[PDB]
Design a protein around this ligand. Structure first.
Ligand SMILES: OC[C@H]1CCCCN1c1nc(Nc2cc(C3CC3)[nH]n2)c2c[nH]nc2n1
Length: 304
């Protein structure tokens, strides 16, 4: 399959996905109700854009991406269903981008968004210009460069998303495991916890699990993770720990302890121990990746 067609390519987090797919070398087409600077950019990058929804826009497509669900009203979808051209939801195509890059999946009920951004900020300080996914929207700092150009793809992993178990990351963080989304799993918290174990088992044997052992549920499932694991937290028995936490204004300072490394003084421009924990998770990923102490310090502190 070589040509991907987006129904409503302008809106949502549709445009970012199309942009990455162009970067990967696919033929990309899309329809939308109104032309915009978003569709002009996609067209400049090689996408074929149709204004209006007629069945002939899906011609030649090997797969359709829709933003919400399959709508019989929209004729492109119905013309695809009738040719058995698969129609996949936006979120699933978004998840699969990770198979083409060195993916870093940030899971956890709370803190996914700040941790993803901290990671992207540090990697960017290290010259790596990652593409990152927050709220289903693809971003990077390069602006002129196509999304997906970096080797690195940093993405929120939401345990209530239907594609949660279809991510193929190289690195996975679990900041914490809460019962918010029990209804997704029959309303059973034990089922929810098993899904996080399953999610971590999507790592390859050479992958990394980054686990916040300050959360008692993360700590409970730790012995089931049969994947390389680095723990972090304020707990005294974490691999990567924060000590001597202090303040200077809205800036939080602390010293991070790492195995086989000297103590490193960092600071982050956001308050509360949760942003200390977000920094530790970032520090673990950057360290394993070989990023320098200078870029870790610069990425964490210059983060607004
Ligand atoms: O159960 C401990 C959890 C439960 C509730 C939030 C505090 N806790 C936490 N948070 C993190 N990050 C966050 C959280 C938020 C906003 C929601 C406040 N922004 N960033 C974490 C990164 N690693 N570990 C974490 N723990």
């Amino acid at each position: 399959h070589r040509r991907i067609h987006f129904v409503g390519i302008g809106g949502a987090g549709m445009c970012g996905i199309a942009e990455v797919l162009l970067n990967l070398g696919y033929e990309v087409s899309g329809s939308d109700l109104k032309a915009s600077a978003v569709t002009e950019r996609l067209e400049k990058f090689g996408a074929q854009i149709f204004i209006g929804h007629q069945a002939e826009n899906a011609d030649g497509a090997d797969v359709l991406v829709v933003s919400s669900a399959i709508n019989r009203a929209n004729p492109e979808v119905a013309s695809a269903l009738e040719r058995r051209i698969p129609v996949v939801p936006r979120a699933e195509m978004l998840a699969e981008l990770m198979r083409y890059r060195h993916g870093i999946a940030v899971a956890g009920t709370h803190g996914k968004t700040t941790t993803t951004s901290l990671i992207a900020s540090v990697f960017a300080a290290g010259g790596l210009d990652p593409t990152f996914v927050i709220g289903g929207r693809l971003n990077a700092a390069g602006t002129n460069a196509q999304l997906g150009a970096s080797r690195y793809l940093v993405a929120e992993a939401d345990e209530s998303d239907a594609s949660f178990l279809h991510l193929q990351p190289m690195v996975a963080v679990v900041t914490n495991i809460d019962a918010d989304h029990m209804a997704t799993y029959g309303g059973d918290f034990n089922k929810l916890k098993k899904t996080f174990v399953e999610f971590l088992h999507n790592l390859p044997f050479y992958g990394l699990a980054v686990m916040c052992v300050d959360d008692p549920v993360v700590r409970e499932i730790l012995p089931q993770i049969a994947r390389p694991t680095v723990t972090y937290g304020l707990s005294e028995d974490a691999d990567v720990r924060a000590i001597n936490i202090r303040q200077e204004g809205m800036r939080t300072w602390f010293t991070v302890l790492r195995p086989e490394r000297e103590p490193l003084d960092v600071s982050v421009n956001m308050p509360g121990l949760h942003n200390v924990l977000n920094s530790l998770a970032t520090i673990v990923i950057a360290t394993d990746e070989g990023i320098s102490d200078e870029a870790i310090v610069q990425g964490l502190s210059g983060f607004q």
